[PDB]
Write a protein that binds this ligand. Structure first.
Ligand SMILES: CC(C)(COP(=O)(O)OP(=O)(O)OC[C@H]1O[C@@H](n2cnc3c(N)ncnc32)[C@@H](O)[C@@H]1OP(=O)(O)O)[C@@H](O)C(=O)NCCC(=O)NCCSCC(=O)Nc1ccn([C@@H]2O[C@H](CO)[C@H](O)[C@@H]2O)c(=O)n1
Ligand SMILES: CC(C)(COP(=O)(O)OP(=O)(O)OC[C@H]1O[C@@H](n2cnc3c(N)ncnc32)[C@@H](O)[C@@H]1OP(=O)(O)O)[C@@H](O)C(=O)NCCC(=O)NCCSCC(=O)Nc1ccn([C@@H]2O[C@H](CO)[C@H](O)[C@@H]2O)c(=O)n1
Ligand SMILES: Nc1ncnc2c1ncn2[C@@H]1O[C@H](COP(=O)(O)OP(=O)(O)O)[C@@H](O)[C@H]1O
Ligand SMILES: Nc1ncnc2c1ncn2[C@@H]1O[C@H](COP(=O)(O)OP(=O)(O)O)[C@@H](O)[C@H]1O
Lengths: 821, 821
């Protein structure tokens, strides 16, 4: 006698085409799943689909009757863009937030989601379970890890109306939030149909006569997708290259699939040069899948009218790089990286999938005097921050000849308003004068306790620091929840009682350091790296130092303010409060844990700070971001040569010696060493730096070198000048300074003069303005051509020569005076 | 009573459609020309065309009745691709060989060519005329200039059968070679027509039905041009991109015009991406002229089916850069420079006009997996050497899927076998064991005396040294003929009597130097440059030296061997003979000058050489050419940073101190100064040099610095090493040498280590192989990326790191031993 709730929930999910959720507890879950599949199959025959099964590393007879796909947790990326009738998760030890999102969105509506839990006497042991991720965050300085994600995961099962926590012998648990589910009325679909379906049938048959719309539009499944297809084709049909269509929606809405049909329409419309740009070739798996689907709807013949060129040479062997069409005249569909903007000088259509993830300058150069298609993801898994989307939307409007924007709401695989989708979005959190503001430390125990007040703030703070991420990674939530030493700080204004304060800025601080001299020397003699810390474990390796790792410090993992209050002062003010705080300036029912709840908003005054020596931040170098860090008295110590592939910017590490009463000389050695490294390294992979940006780093690094008085530079004597330049070199300089010689001859002297000036030897003798320093820096250490410098400075080439010659007569006169005197 | 020869010659030229030549002598030539035009017009009405007139800086009534175009001698390039019924040259002072060719080829068949000569008592004063060109060759060391081109010009008038040296009062001179011209038989063209015309009419009407050939083929004027059109279109019609058509002919044959119709055919055939590459946009004036002519034959409508985009922004405002076609789908015709090979990744047709003038590597990268059209000029004005054409033809055959070659012979504007064309080609000369060979000095007085034996050798030697010129410049003949100090040397084998020796190698040596210390200081204090000499006038300016210009030397203006005997030894052997020779090791009838003729083949033994200090050569740097010069014991002194636009290579100057018994130390200072300049300048515009090529220059320059013993480098002491690297830098080096650190960290030390090695400080301490030196040179002084180095060396990137790490453990151990010891 099976319980009647399981058949009731299964029928409810199938009738409305919304996913159902189940969790099995026990060591004999094989009996449960086969009974679950029996109920699902005995009530409907349209669900005999693939049963996705994921593990890290009778039932025997039944597994040989239905299609089962076994996919590894690390290999779950291969099932992207697919559809399965049931998702199964077996090993709890490896279901990260990223994996949970990936294996859930690939389930069709009306299916089942079943999660396998190992044999348990009671469910109270799940909150303290070990994982495969706390093993990452273990450090010798901070080892103990408190598991909080499992606490939130088990408490959130009650907030899902389609979740049934089933048992080994088919029994329901009180923690399940769907125990009170009532059966739906019997379906009546013989004549009555959903209004969206009637609207979808209306638009399909209305344009059936017209071609190529009549054949392509049958591929659409939603009204929102269909309206995008007409919007795309309408731009194509005008045969005018002054259009631009921007599409934004969530993940799983069909923007990429609708993008492919738009491209297939353009091919049939007589378009020769078609280009696709995307952050990764992986994102084009579905886009190129529906181009062929659209081609099949157009009755194109394989190996006769089109060919598929697969770029199997690189690691992404499955990626499609080019498709050639030779029906009447040779038409082509080429996939290029966003950086390759030179090929687009002859194009007619550019499709930019996931344009939000592309850096804004790349999109700016990608768009030209042709037709551009754009798609973006604003919510859901792998979403984008609201700030970058706003920047992209505003930028396109400035360029506007015609721009049209559309949106998609209804999903494809599951009905809108899905219960499991809402539960997962909530679980992963996918979607005043500064002087009066005060910083508050957020207690992580109450924050992730799934309390209604706690949950509301968690959504606000999560959306605060993911508002600028190029891609939304849910694994960061696992990081904050289960970190051993990460502390969360929020800056709020003066807020009255009864109203939760609005987070104006969120700072995540990780405690780093306390490295024993044995541990550093053990691994500095090898190539292995625990990578528990970043700032102490990099400066020690980069500088081959032994004392810095022994210090104790903090790493600013993430700092973000509200996008509405940007450039107002709520970020710098939070940093100063955080800096002063570390300076010691402030002296089987499983209900939510109502007890053991400390004040969520524990003020900094009532908590004693730790004794810290420095604060460090590792961040992607940008001119605006660097200016903010330098304002907070940070000095660079490191700057990675290999620019990040996704963003195109170099990682920069800054360290501030916040502790007062301590020697500011251990950092003076680090800043000086980097400063002398930067000058010589300005020609290796730093040649692409703008002159102004590279100058600012040099000034900041030089300022940091002044923390140590022993690093003060000495003047240049006459004896040193003679050792550096032969009399032939001097006579060349005098003639050029008089305007009697071309500048090309005196060009080998750039490294000598520029190094002398920027190392401080010539800095006090001759004073140069901001513009002259930038030209000398580029010509001397970046080895930039004059024409390249003229373009970058937005100045004529002759004017650059005039400024450069001004630099010489200042240097030439001092050199002559030094030798003569 | 006018003489009957002028009407007879005019009728002869008109009937056969060959140009006629006249020369007028006197101060009242206006009476002669108007009588000449009267005879021309009174006998035919199809000659009332434009009368081109060129000057540097009644008749009044008659000039207002006919079209006259006045063009400046320097501005004669604007009449390129035009057609005129009569060419007039007035000022003898500026009719250079280049100008003479330019103003002659633009005359239609049957027209007149009249050259105006100022009033003369006798013609004997023409041989000694000053010009506007000898003013260039005047030098303070060598001032007197003997005019020989005018001597050859006046003697060659007798070798032209259509040249009548007319007088002021219509009288003929004995020097004229057409005084015995007999009248042609009366024409019979009512029914009888030339066989070429019948063949031309046959091919036009045969393909009249077929389109787009039927309309385009009417543009052809010769059978050879027509056969090219069918050859071009046949490649287009196959719709297969595995074809390549190479066209070679003389200048004025119609290769460019036939190229345009081929492009217009491709547009009508459904070709979207069409690209044109040429050395200069000027060469495309006629090609783009006939594309529109072909478009008009296709009845394309301006501003409705095609648009003309003119690149007026640069200096070549008349150049057409792009043409867009939007009849059915957007088709385009884009003009790109040969260097821009990245855009061709999507193309369907590439037209390479004047492919011979393009460097071979550029053509190699221009051709890809598409259809390529090629045209070249092999003879006539602005021709190309036989060596480069052979290199291009062979290279294409190696790449062969299908290749077809065609040729054109019959001209367009004038009938084949034109008398004036043959006279001009002759006038401008447009078209054994080495141990047994001996060098011979060619006497310039007899060489340019127009003697039948002398003329035959002149054609062989001219074709010898223009066999490698990218473009054929006839002004060089004016240089050799009227130079004040240039001496011509030819190397011949042992040849029996009665047979003129075959020139195996020709060397043109210009005597340079003897600059007073006042003259150098006068202009070294200013920016003006007489530019009479090159090697003494550049080393003095580049090095700010005062003694080198006072020396006496020789410049090897041009050295070329027979293309059949290349890489055999006839060039190096001639150089050694020339070097030893300067070392003093060898103790109104105007007939051709039969008297005053020295031995044309005066041996070096019977002529006393001049006391010389050095021999210098200015040449375009190539790896093969540099190896030959270094073998002859030459050392570089200069290397221009700005690569030549046409060829893409940098000018290099080498100097050899051939004089024995003299101090080889004045050059040791020059070579050492360049060697220290090259190391620092390897990052400014020399970054494009291959590692092997840049290494060879460094070795050669370093070897030259050894001529001065005082320039020998000293060893590196322990004190110097500590001054260069801080203990942090040393500890970084030890860790990397052990394989305990990434190579990116130890990268700022490249300029320090590479400079130390290549300056000689570390050269004797540590020995590096040829491959290791090249990697260290590029990574240290060229700042090349590893991936760039891996591609250039045709080696995997990991292997480059392995070799680079080998370089360190040699340097690291010496540094440790130096400090420890
Ligand atoms: C706005 C803000 C800076 C200050 O906020 P404020 O508004 O409060 O500025 P304030 O008024 O105080 O001073 C005024 C002065 O600030 C300046 N300023 C004004 N506006 C801007 C501006 N828009 N940008 C910059 N500077 C600005 C200046 O212009 C002005 O000078 P001015 O005064 O006269 O005008 C800060 O709060 C904020 O939200 N930044 C956005 C989030 C962020 O990135 N924070 C830094 C994180 S570091 C550790 C870290 O994790 N790094 C990473 C990052 C990514 N990745 C990977 O890449 C992927 C995603 O990228 C992937 O996810 C992965 O993660 C990674 O691996 N590691
Ligand atoms: C062939 C030749 C070198 C030796 O002749 P050989 O056959 O005899 O060589 P040999 O047997 O003695 O030694 C064997 C060794 O020679 C080597 N070697 C073997 N074959 C080659 C090879 N094909 N090329 C190179 N090196 C080779 C080596 O590979 C082998 O080593 P290996 O041994 O084991 O194998 C010489 O004779 C010759 O024709 N060179 C062609 C004409 C030329 O350019 N001469 C130099 C002129 S400099 C002053 C000057 O005016 N410069 C310019 C030039 C242009 N421009 C502007 O650019 C426009 C036009 O460009 C425009 O017109 C304007 O003018 C300008 O402004 N200024
Ligand atoms: N018109 C359609 N017809 C059928 N399936 C579709 C359609 N549109 C989307 N899908 C489903 O959605 C998946 C594609 O993901 P999609 O939502 O297009 O990515 P994105 O979120 O980038 O738009 C495919 O696996 C497919 O099953
Ligand atoms: N098919 C043609 N019809 C008329 N004129 C032509 C034709 N072909 C060549 N010409 C004449 O030749 C000139 C073009 O020079 P051309 O010989 O094509 O240059 P290239 O020597 O590079 O082929 C034009 O001025 C034109 O008058």
């Amino acid at each position: 006698t099976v319980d009647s709730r399981i058949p009731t929930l299964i029928r409810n999910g199938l009738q409305t085409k919304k996913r159902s959720f189940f969790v099995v507890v026990g060591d004999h879950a094989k009996e449960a799943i086969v009974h679950l599949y029996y109920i699902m199959s005995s009530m409907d025959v349209r669900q005999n689909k693939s049963v996705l099964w994921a593990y890290k590393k009778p039932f025997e007879l039944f597994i040989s009757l239905n299609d089962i796909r076994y996919c590894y947790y690390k290999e779950t990326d291969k099932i992207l863009g697919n559809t399965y009738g049931m998702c199964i998760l077996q090993d709890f030890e490896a279901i990260t937030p990223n994996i949970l999102a990936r294996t859930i969105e690939t389930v069709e509506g009306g299916g089942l989601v079943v999660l396998l839990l190992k044999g348990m006497t009671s469910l109270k042991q799940l909150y303290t379970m070990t994982m495969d991720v706390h093993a990452r965050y273990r450090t010798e300085a901070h080892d103990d890890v408190i598991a909080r994600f499992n606490e939130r995961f088990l408490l959130s099962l009650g907030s899902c109306e389609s979740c049934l926590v089933i048992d080994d012998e088919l029994n329901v648990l009180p923690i399940s939030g769907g125990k009170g589910v009532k059966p739906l009325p019997p379906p009546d679909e013989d004549e009555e149909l959903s209004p969206a379906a009637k609207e979808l049938k209306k638009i399909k048959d209305e344009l059936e006569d017209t071609q190529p719309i009549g054949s392509l539009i049958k591929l659409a499944r939603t009204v929102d997708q269909a309206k995008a297809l007409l919007t795309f084709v309408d731009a194509i049909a005008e045969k005018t290259l002054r259009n631009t269509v921007t599409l934004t929606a969530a993940r799983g809405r069909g923007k990429s699939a609708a993008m492919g049909v738009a491209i297939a329409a353009a091919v049939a419309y007589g378009y020769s040069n078609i280009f696709i740009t995307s952050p990764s070739p992986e994102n084009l798996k579905t886009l190129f899948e529906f181009v062929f689907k659209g081609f099949d709807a157009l009755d194109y013949k394989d190996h006769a009218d089109y060919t598929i060129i697969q770029s199997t040479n690189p690691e992404f062997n499955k990626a499609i790089v080019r498709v050639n069409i030779h029906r009447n005249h040779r038409q082509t569909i080429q996939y290029i990286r966003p950086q390759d903007a030179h090929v687009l000088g002859q194009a007619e259509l550019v499709v930019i999938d996931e344009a939000a993830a592309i850096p804004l300058p790349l999109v700016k150069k990608l768009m030209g005097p042709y037709l551009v298609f754009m798609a973006s993801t604003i919510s859901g898994y792998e979403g984008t921050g609201r700030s970058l989307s706003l920047k992209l939307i505003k930028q396109l409007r400035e360029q506007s000849r015609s721009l049209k924007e559309i949106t998609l709401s209804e999903p494809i695989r599951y009905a809108q308003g899905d219960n499991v989708e809402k539960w997962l979005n909530t679980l992963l959190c996918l979607d005043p004068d500064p002087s009066q503001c005060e910083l508050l430390h957020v207690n992580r125990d109450t924050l992730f306790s799934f309390h209604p007040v706690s949950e509301k703030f968690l959504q606000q703070m999560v959306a605060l620091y993911v508002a600028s991420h190029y891609k939304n990674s849910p694994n960061d939530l696992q990081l904050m929840s289960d970190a051993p030493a990460h502390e969360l700080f929020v800056l709020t204004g003066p807020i009255q009682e009864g109203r939760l304060p609005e987070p104006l800025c969120v700072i995540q601080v990780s405690l780093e350091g306390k490295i024993s001299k044995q541990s550093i020397l053990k691994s500095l003699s090898r190539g292995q790296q625990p990578a528990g810390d970043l700032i102490p474990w990099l400066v020690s390796q980069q500088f081959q130092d032994d004392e810095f790792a022994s210090l104790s410090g903090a790493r600013i993992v993430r700092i973000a303010t509200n996008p509405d209050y940007m450039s107002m002062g709520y970020g710098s003010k939070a940093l100063q409060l955080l800096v002063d705080y570390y300076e010691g300036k402030f002296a089987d029912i499983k209900v939510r844990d109502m007890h053991e709840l400390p004040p969520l908003f524990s003020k900094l005054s009532e908590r004693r700070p730790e004794k810290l020596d420095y604060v460090g931040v590792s961040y992607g170098l940008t001119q605006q971001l660097h200016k903010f860090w330098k304002r907070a008295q940070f000095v660079p110590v490191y700057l990675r040569q290999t620019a990040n592939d996704l963003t195109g910017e170099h990682t920069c590490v800054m360290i501030r010696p916040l502790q007062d009463g301590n020697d500011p000389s251990w950092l003076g050695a680090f800043a000086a060493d980097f400063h002398k490294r930067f000058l010589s390294l300005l020609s290796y992979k730093f040649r692409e730096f703008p002159s102004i940006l590279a100058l600012t780093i040099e000034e900041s690094a030089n300022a940091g070198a002044m923390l140590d008085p022993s690093n003060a530079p000495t003047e240049l004597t006459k004896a040193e000048l003679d050792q550096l330049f032969t009399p032939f070199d001097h006579k060349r300089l005098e003639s050029y300074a008089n305007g009697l010689l071309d500048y090309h001859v005196v060009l080998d002297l750039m490294p000598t003069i520029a190094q002398l000036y920027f190392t401080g030897r010539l800095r006090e003798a001759v004073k140069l303005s901001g513009l002259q320093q930038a030209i000398l820096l580029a010509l001397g250490l970046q080895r930039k051509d004059i024409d390249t410098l003229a373009t970058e400075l937005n100045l004529p080439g002759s004017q650059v020569l005039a400024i450069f010659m001004k630099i010489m007569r200042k240097v030439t006169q001092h050199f002559g005076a030094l030798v003569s005197g």
